[PDB]
């Protein structure tokens, strides 16, 4: 501003405005997509909480890998952490069936 008079500074200022605003436009547009990504996980977390925690889920490999027993939520910075309790079996044995 102190180095140039209005007429060419107006051209130069418009160049900064059309760049900063477009840079700001990119940030918000890229921010909306991340928000959609978070809500997809947030909605999944809400669904995970309503089934794994407040109940037992028959869905395989949803509330922990294996047969599900219960769950315990733990708050975390900008997120939630689940403690799935599972009933993975072990020590199989051959048998003859009919």
């Amino acid at each position: 501003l102190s180095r140039l008079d209005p007429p060419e500074a107006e051209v130069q200022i418009d160049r900064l405005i059309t760049g900063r605003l477009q840079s700001l436009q990119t940030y918000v547009t890229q921010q909306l997509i991340r928000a959609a990504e978070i809500r997809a996980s947030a909605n999944l977390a809400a669904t995970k909480m309503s089934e794994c925690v407040l109940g037992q889920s028959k869905r395989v490999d949803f509330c922990g890998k294996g047969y599900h027993l219960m769950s315990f939520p733990q708050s975390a910075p900008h997120g939630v952490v689940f403690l799935h309790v599972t009933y993975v079996p072990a020590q199989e044995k051959n048998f003859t069936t009919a």
Binding site: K48, L69, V81, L83
Partner: peptide, 15 residues
């Protein structure tokens, strides 16, 4: 199977 193992996994999700 004749035995089991109560395994506590962990799951982390942004909210």
């Amino acid at each position: 199977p004749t035995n089991f193992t109560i395994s506590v996994t962990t799951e982390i999700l942004p909210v």
